[PDB]
Amino acid sequence: XXNXXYX
Numbered sequence: 836x837x838n839x840x841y842x
């Protein structure tokens with residue numbers, strides 16, 4: 836991924 840979250 837690379838982005839983060841949290842969803």
Ligand SMILES: *[C@@H]1O[C@H](CO)[C@@H](O)[C@H](O)[C@H]1O[C@H]1C[C@](C)(N)[C@H](O)[C@H](C)O1
Nearest residue numbers: 836837838839840841842
């Ligand atoms: C998400 O990124 C932050 C900042 O770099 C780290 O401090 C954190 O430890 C990291 O969270 C981990 C734990 C989690 C949420 N279970 C996932 O595995 C993520 C990808 O990594």
Ligand SMILES: [Cl-]
Nearest residue numbers: 836837838839
């Ligand atoms: Cl991500």
